[model samples]
Target chain A: NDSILLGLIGQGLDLSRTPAMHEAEGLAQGRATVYRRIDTLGSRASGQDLKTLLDAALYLGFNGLNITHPYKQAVLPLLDEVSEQATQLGAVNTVVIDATGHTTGHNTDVSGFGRGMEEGLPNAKLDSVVQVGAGGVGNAVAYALVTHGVQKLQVADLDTSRAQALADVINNAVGREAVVGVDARGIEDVIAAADGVVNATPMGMPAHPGTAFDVSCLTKDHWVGDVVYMPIETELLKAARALGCETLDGTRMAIHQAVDAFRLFTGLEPDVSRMRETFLSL
Target chain B: NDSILLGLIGQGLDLSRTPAMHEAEGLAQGRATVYRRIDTLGSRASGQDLKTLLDAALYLGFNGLNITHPYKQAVLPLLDEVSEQATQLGAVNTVVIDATGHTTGHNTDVSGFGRGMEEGLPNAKLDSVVQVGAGGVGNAVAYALVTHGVQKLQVADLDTSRAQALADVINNAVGREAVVGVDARGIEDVIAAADGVVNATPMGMPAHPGTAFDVSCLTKDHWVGDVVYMPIETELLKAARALGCETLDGTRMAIHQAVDAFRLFTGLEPDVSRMRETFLSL
Candidate 1:
């Protein structure tokens, strides 16, 4: 069988690590895999741009695509059919083009984060979780926390509307009792008291380049996680480790999310172990 | 030293082979190389979209970019400056972003094809050449042929306006002695009498699979080349081989052009051997 052809559409993301991770998974599963990154300038990849991209991808015969930042929500209206979860989340991170050329949208971020947490923080029971940034990844992680039976979810973002929107999504997905909004500046206090803290913002990414919070305040009781994997090790993760807190590196989240996304695109479960090993080797 | 970051903006193109080629070159030279693909859907990737993509790449710290079909000409107006060749060609296929984020456009297709012909048809000098198609690649190839001392060139396309436009560009660049136009249907008679024939249309690509011409009527004296590489052995090349006529495969032109374009973006010479080996392995 031929390799699965995957295209990515979003703000100029350098997807260099994608092949290393996906190809390792393919090797373990005895299948060929081909992935391409489609870097859309943020302003250009608006709603209409996404629709045209979807059309082009189908015309060019791509099996599926992984949509990224600035386009996750913009692409929703362009899709012919949105999955229940994608419509509910109001954002899509993965898309599958069926044999008939119909596109289906899915939000693998939630499931991916849940799986990553299970793999990286197996012993942690979610009592209270403080999630920074309430955007696409934030919504997914917040929803996953609620689904995992967290007693309280505190979401914060610079944009109050985004936080409120995430709260509403979680409110409908699970129950209002499972989630609440906190001020962005008050995240440090929440992190000190919460069982787990996730940095879902682009703060630590290479482009933005900074810690989301003063991670020096992290304690042994807190579990810290980051979603930015380009550096693999962020200052936040280092601080958490220095404090003897259990830490989930961005690599875990990135690999797990990519693996889940691959399965959705190809209908074949990727070997997570192989993908992780390949990333670690890099 | 850190690897150079390359960006791409265009419609959905399966660039699966690009990574391996670049990575292999990087490894051999002990420099890291990163290639990013930004999908700017053809119709939507206008001035605003090009600016956003360029900003994103600069913000993300890309060294340069390769602009593909549909947007090649569209991005011309957005560039800070255009090289003399690109200005003369009136098409931009490569861009270099300096430290200050200023973008300069270049036309590597002209030099790339010149180099490919130099290497592939070492002793052949074109007194006259028949070029099929007059789109982006066709125009670039026609310009390259003119630059290579082809005294008389026949540009043909289903859309006669496009062919005439290419002829006009060549005429302006090197005077009327180097360019002319012919009908696509009757071009066979011209090909039979020309020194060289180039297929620049997307006729033989997997997405549009078919031979651009019937090769049976041609004699062994006419050198032929096809610009289709997915099925490396295009029908035209196959027919040329069976007829014992000298033939140059599209992959050679593609690799040569990509290598030159890569250099234009990175300001570093690409390891051609590594790129060639990667293509061969694929």
Candidate 2:
């Protein structure tokens, strides 16, 4: 099969893990996938710059794009149309530009996060969870958790305004007092007692090199998740694993989200098992 | 061996044919070359666009590039230095930007055109020849012919000043007695008597198709060369072939030039025969 050409538009994204993750998914589907990153950082990339980059991607024949950071919300206005869920979420992570140049935006982070949590914790009820960092991924995961019947949701971030904003979105989507906002500095106490803990922050990333919260208080009873997948087993996940806690690695969420995005682009279901094997090899 | 990444920075270029050309060369050498096109057109591409595009190429891990069309002259200032021949020619058709972002420019059109003529007309001497157009490629080809000891060179173009300018360049480079200029309308009479005829104009390209000269007036003694290769066998080449005039097809020039450019970028002599076969197959 011909390789599926994928483009990534981002700023300051740690993308070393992307090749391995996509390659695994491609192998699972018995096909080849080639992903290329286009960095549009600093003041050089305005709304027009992002539009130009998107046009270039289409002109150069990329199948689809995974848009990340800084430009995610800014890119919304340039797109042809947005999906209902994406419009409701007010953020889009994946975009498929058709032959007619009509861009269809979709939010996969929600589905990917929901699927990862369910797959990693089959018996755990989504009653209470502490979601750290209410950025792009955080907003999606919070929405997914609320939809998954998480009654009590606590959103925290370094930017208190962002946390409050994401919490309001989740609350509106779920139509209840099921969501609340907290300062990330106060997340440690919440995580120690929550049914599940999710770290969407960049703290456990290779550059940051630290846990989102002190894992000394975490126990085997809690389910832990992290969105940083380059190292696969981030420090927070490692600590959770050491304590015998059920852990959802970032790879699962990445793969699930990628599968959804892949289907949106190719109109085909990818092989999940093969993708898992490929991820393991990487 | 892992595939060598090749980048192209220019306008009006489609890479659909490049993969086959480079792949055939790579196959003969037991390797592979992956060619990618970076369309630096429209508003995103200003005078600083080449520098930005070169930075993107290096960041994307491309080993080298084939600069083409309008940007060839614009890209010269972005390079660290250019070959003496290229510096003299005042243009570059190829550039090799290393891992450290140092760019070296070369005008492969020199060797490519020279070698192509020598191969196609082995017994022909550099006598009275009429060259049509005086753009970047025309400039390079005319300079190359002069260097090959052409006794009489007549440059013809719709832009009379450009033609006179190129003739002046040849006159300065070789001798005033060996170079002259003529309006494009008067080239037919020159073609009837000239020892060699070269079409550097875009007259027979896909967008505009026709013979540069009346085919019925051409004789077997005249050597005809065309620079348009998109269709491989253009009407001008077909007309020249019908007249039993020794014909040099544009594809030969394209392949020969590309091979020289490839070598300059990769620091390895390309298999011209393999590239020729790839061109023919296309």
Candidate 3:
């Protein structure tokens, strides 16, 4: 009676730890589960698209699918219903499909990030925060910053309008001008008053490698956090750590997101510590 | 990369071994699998039927489904294609649905029983045999009997037409009147010259408990085989063992069937011994 079937729909998931983390905890529950990687990167390279994989998952029988990267936002419209948090974040990372073929979208990223920050950056200065890149992860990390008690947030992105859109949502949700958009060209000004910096952009990925800003501007009192866990210690975190500043690695948020999603999938409270151990082991 | 979903659609499936046996082997294969029980006893009692369960399974994203009792024959037409053995037996116990949403049916009972007979009764006499019951499992057992060198066969069922129809098929397939159907009044005549006895009916099950035939005709030299594995040692096996007859218990066939089904599901040749151990442990 205790079994689960989960899938991760994304690109370049050969290194993903989501499957392993889930399966490990499933064993601890005295049950079993199967997690599949529907790599859209491989699929697209083979002349197929995300829709093809999505429909195939529906046709083949996947109880829940974790949508990642590019498809997280793309999957929102495909779902039958979505939680309010997902609608605000403008992306969904977890999707649950029941026996009647109905799907519900959920965004664990916001809550996952909120919990991650508390664990990894318990004493992080949140009085003033500067976050780079205003995409889907940025949307989630930004929402978490406000709820986590950031007095003011400076949001910046290559596309000014995307940055403004996220800033507006954060302000509206918090019912105040707790956030403001900064011009991408004026990168230094965004973190001018910041006690800590966040890289919510996809800049540190293997394919898109680089620090979002110059290391010369970082200070010993400055703290850094990131939403990118692919490399775990992104260039942003390494620079801050080398500067002797407190830093929270990107893996924290992603791992905790899985913890929440697994709970939703199995209706059981998972061992958070074991999940972290498993995530790092992978 | 390791994920699979499966289901068993049947009535009163509370005692099914397919779920645990398959999941246990799945763990050994380093994969995740979810096996759901789509109980049709309540479905039928609530004005639902096999189609309801079939659709529910499809909607839930089952990689495959194991069909059992009352629905083995009912599931035939719903499939896109079926194996030749299933076609001949007019039943299917396994259905695999590929990514394209196409489902193909297979009958493991024949291969399962065939393997079981070879393993348990390697040199048992098959010159003349009496097989009780002409249902789904019976159909597969009878076919295996012919292929395994049952030169003369007597088939008996409470329903005379079912037995006669099976005998006709066996005779036609062998291109001879090698099989004969008998009535209750002809029981003594049916086993008069038998070298082995097979109880293929569901009569040995707890719901319909009892031996299919009395022990009056038993002999020390005759061999006994049963397809029901509920108690593992059914009353028939106990009686046959008491007569000092070599016996093949029901576990052999069912376990081998699960072993074969696991192979089809994972495309991996499972350890047959491990599967037998898992089944017996259950």
Candidate 4:
């Protein structure tokens, strides 16, 4: 049996390149596979409720699932165990199903973003960082920042209390001098003094297009990053490039995340270069 | 999306080569498909119940399913519509799920057996036939006989009631006086007088090895058919051949059934020669 089954459970992903990337890579390793979409975008009314689809995955004997968007956090309780980092962020983007059908959740987004930043923004100052969005992806971004040696992190959110709570948690968890909470009002001053700024919100997504900040204050020296890949060169990345600032695009993180998932599903090392090319070509 | 998915729902199918056959044929068709087994033989106590797995297939977005063994009859009410012939026999061997997610039932076994006979035994006698067994496959064999213009078909079973019930249904539903239910005691004389004999019973199967009945009364003019394919040449078929009788093997029927189901799943015609080669290779 030189075959395994897999799928991505998300919305508006009929055009996703994950299927082709995995299918082509399977040829080299000889674990031929077929991955499908359990898209909920237009299928919700057809008895394709989230829980129903999850149960379906279990019944169909899928080796693993790549969760995304609205379902990254929705699938937590459905899993048997979660890695410490995924549990801390209260979100999961990769799930591994074992022989007994026990699902273990892990946050590939955290590592993917962190690795992309280190590779793309090498030797950039990390003394302080300004960030936006304190939601699920935001939490992962914050952890990635602290793990990579940021002394202080400024988190902004429309929900100020949520920002404040996340700030307190980040401060205590990262051994930082200060991880401060701020409203969108306070992000500008914070950006002015920080080494870089990160957009962890859906603002830069195709469905929700635009940068999180008014970039008049953004300088050529301050590196910029956005956690949106649908438009790999996001609006945020475009403006930051115009400012002559070094940038990190979510495309790198997306490719990096899928690499580990490929390894997890097939028990074979994936050719990351071909996969990255596969993603861009799509 | 260059992918398709199919599955088999059955029990005691460890020796099944259906998956590899479909997968290899899929490679040329551009569907790049994967077929899975919902083996309920030992998976039930592991919480892999039949109903749970059936619902799972729908949720997991399976293209179609081939239901077998006990579930052939059990899945009748679970379907949206069954073909007229399948309804006649009260059995379904294949299910097709259209874009609307409506699962329709079909009995390829009925057409498969009849078509194989025409293809393999073109000019063989079908005027009068004696068949053993009245179970699922037995019913299909009976249908195959009457549909192909047999004027008289003697059906016998260990359970005399099942034989009579099937004979009554076959006689009432079909516009023929050919179907006659017989107890085991009446089969010998019926076979001696018939132009052909069908071993639709499990007696020729791997588990139930040996001929269904004494072939001493058989003659060179009497052609033989067996729906058991595991041992391509069953004891009955071998004996019939040695007695100078032409024989119809079950391999053709099994291959024919899978061919139709494959077409239904991929929406692309599969190469019959390639599929048969794949089947024999396994």
Candidate 5:
């Protein structure tokens, strides 16, 4: 009688690996789980609005849904309850629906990134980290870093104000002036002084190639991490590896996010290593 | 790469065998299929309207849905297309959705009953078969009987007008006046003259016990069939068998309906005997 019905709600998600990871784990757990990609990219969702989609999922008795891209923030207000972490981050990447059709929103990106850093970097210095890209993904990574002992986080973006906006939220939440917004002009300087660097931008993705920052600013002591995982070895991570610096590929964060979401969705402990294998194979 | 997402949108389906049958066959066919019960009975559907439920299934990427009870006719107008068979029956028991979210309504109940009769009561004379109850299911079964060589069919119901209406539809569709509406008062007389008697009513169910018509009218030459299957050996079938007559259980119609729906949903062949085995096991 064990079963799970999940879907990813977003645009342009044809190549997403999240569905495969969850489906594989559920199968291993002896549960008949079906993960559908309810993409809005084409005629799949029929141009329905986010609220309609969420309601539809609830009415159809979906166990949970993975929110991505534009929907993470848009879906926050539609849920019956939002986890404190998700409310603070102003985004929801995972939604759990109970038998009574009650929906609760959660942000796994924060915990996922934290777990990835803990496992992948394994005691790497997070005292001072320069993070590029202050968008939604970047905001989550910044929150992940600050909450997990990153003492000083320099948030950078093309739009300096957007970067500052995210920094302000993180600093206020942490009840300290531990984060500051920086412009692209000073990104290299911040990286040169920081103990590690993180790229949370779309720059390393296939559609948007190249690195978020100049890898020349990195040194042997610096650790590098990116939020892009399609290629796993993004130009940024490849460049940092050549400098003998420790690196975390975007796959770590992606897999960890899925792992956390799977637990939230099914209330079953998923094997993280098993999920990782599935992710890499995909 | 094969998967099928299905649901049963009906009230009082907590113990339905349809979902289990579809799921087992889907798994056997090497498809990661999931069947959900979107019952309107409790908090499952959240008191949503039929239109919303249908639209929700469409947007949620459901491969198909089995409409039953109150929704069989209600779901017809909501669909983009209704099969000619379903249109004439004025009911739909299956709905198939395409990649473009296009929905088509079909009435597998008609064909399901026909196939059940063909297999269960093979080569049985359909020259004059008397059926009790002319409701949604009765209507489909009446259509099935008339189309399958059941000449001079007698349709009887407590609500004689309803029975007459169903008989009229069947007669017009078959281009012959083969079906005649009869009152329950003369049911015994009709059964004595008919070759077989079919109970399309819910009379033999656990909640509503006892045979639809008195078994005293039946003889060794007569056959009996029932549409109530919780206890497949309905009082009617049991009594008829005591009279040395062949009988068909409700499970046959139930399984065959699912078999046809599965075929329509996935465009894949499903073994009827396999589905029957799964149904009886459940």
Candidate 6:
């Protein structure tokens, strides 16, 4: 088939930019592509479970699906196979469906985040980093950081227990004492000692408008990145940029995830710059 | 949502032109569209039945479906509501799914055939017509002919019982003795008396490869129409054209059906000529 059929399975995903990027790339390359949103909160999927929705998508001719929010972890166990990255993180952001309808889960967030840091903050130090928020995205960001050769990684969340749980998983997977869970109260001290800071929390989003740490703790030598892209230039990135610390916005991570998923789905190397242009336009 | 999601549900529909037609019109109109084919013969849909498939489509974010072949009649009872034409014809080739997932079935073949007659054979006499083939396409063509004001409609099929059944239904719906099921042996007599002849059967297709009746009986005053579009010009239409008779190839009906289905799915009028161009280009 000359067409690529894809969708995102999540709740309230009506405004997702993933579909736009995929469609634009597909159109530029002369393929018929449509990325739909199978929002579980929507009228059509109200009471359906994740398995049912996944099966429905496969049976209805979807080539692949990008998972998000609550379903990311839930969808991993349902797949036939999972990439080592997704297995280690216990989360899957992408699922590829083969011709026989077999599904294989993948974690693009790790690669996407790592790619963002490379492209957006290419010369930034990864020797030591402090990440805030051990929520859904925090685990991926922290895992990406440690796996990208960060010698020491400190994770802090309001829920310290969850942060500790993530820290242990990463430390055990890396076979080294490269990660530690720190108390949110000691965040300033951790930021002071780290080479970089990343706001893995949703703090800087419109719904949660503020940086996760005190701007005073950031220095000219400290590079910063954010996981929230709705505002593109989050307050944390904005403040870090003003202090002459090279900063990375969330669009890089967002665009890279779609770029990775598009490659997994179509087995064609999608134009990353083209996808980024589409993402920025959206 | 700026995207339109559509699919065709049937057996062995991998080569159908419907998806291309819809996608081309959508691209021309600047809508992100992808039309999939959910062939039951395919591995993904093998064990699933019509009801399960329809429900799966709704859950998987399909906005609409164009049904064909064996499923057309089977899908009628599964729909929440059906159009008046679909109700009387007892078949549904198109289904519209609303926001609440309520499905309404419609038969575009009727309007498409009528419109093809209007555009492809304008000013031709429809007072009397002999239609060959009383199968799936036959029913739509016969109904369209009688409804388009063919006073005496003669329906012929190898299986006389099937032709009689369709003739009876069309006559009862019209509330007159408008259609008569005729024996295939006497097809020449019927064609000689009628002002036009329509091939509703698969006779002139690549698989069938022969005219349904003696084309020698057709006169210059008689117009010819066929529902077989694989070759664009069927043997019956080819012979009739050679005799200087106004001819309507199956592409007109094919394009019109897609045009009607596109409008039904998108709630916007599609360019028929543009769709025809796409159809012919394919």
**By TM-score, who's the top model here?**
5
Mind giving the per-residue lDDT tens digits that candidate 5 earns over A1-282? 567899999988888899999988988898878998888876768488999999889888899999998888889889999998888888999999998889999989999999999999997998899999999899899999999999999888999999999988888777898789988885898899999999988987789989877778989989999898888889999999999999988888899999999999999999999999998896
lDDT for A149 (candidate 3) = 84
lDDT of 3 by residue, A1-282 (tens): 567777787778888899889888877887687776666555222344656555544443456789898788888888888888787667889888775446788988888999988998898889998899998788989998888889988888999999999989888777889889998786775575579889988878898899888767788898898888878888888888998999888888888899999887777899998999999997
lDDT of 1 by residue, B1-282 (tens): 444556567767556466456555654665545454555543323233566666555443456777887678887888899998888878898888875567899987788788888888877758988888888888888988888878898888999999998898878977665888888887888888898898998887778877777676578788887777778888788788787888877777677777887777666788787788887787
Best by DockQ: 5
Better of 3 and 5 by TM-score: 5
Better of 2 and 5 by TM-score: 5
Ranking by DockQ: 5, 6, 4, 3, 2, 1
By lDDT: ranked, best first: 5, 6, 4, 3, 1, 2
Q: Write the per-residue lDDT of candidate 6 for residues A2-107, one digit (tens) a residue.
A: 7788988899987899988998888788887888888889998878899988998888888899999889999988999999889888899999999779999998
DockQ of each: 0.05, 0.13, 0.22, 0.49, 0.80, 0.66
Clashing pairs in 2: none
Of candidate 5 chain A, the 10-residue stretch with the lowest lDDT total is A38-47
> What is the RMSD of candidate 1?
8.7
The residue-by-residue lDDT of candidate 6 on B178-252, one tens digit each, is 889889997898899889988888888889999888888988888999888988888888899888999988888
**Tens-digit per-residue lDDT, A155-209, candidate 1:** 9899988998899878886646677888988678878888988888888777887
Predicted complex 6: DockQ: 0.66
lDDT (Cα, 0-100) at A168 in candidate 2: 84
- lDDT per prediction? 0.75, 0.74, 0.80, 0.81, 0.89, 0.88
Candidate with more favorable, higher lDDT: 3 or 6: 6
Q: How far in Å is the alpha carbon of B86 misplaced in model 2?
A: 4.4
Q: Encode model 4's per-residue lDDT on A108-149: one tens digit a residue.
A: 777877888878888789998988988877877888888877
What is candidate 4's CA lDDT for residue A205? 77
Fnat, 2 decimals, each candidate: 0.00, 0.07, 0.25, 0.43, 0.78, 0.76
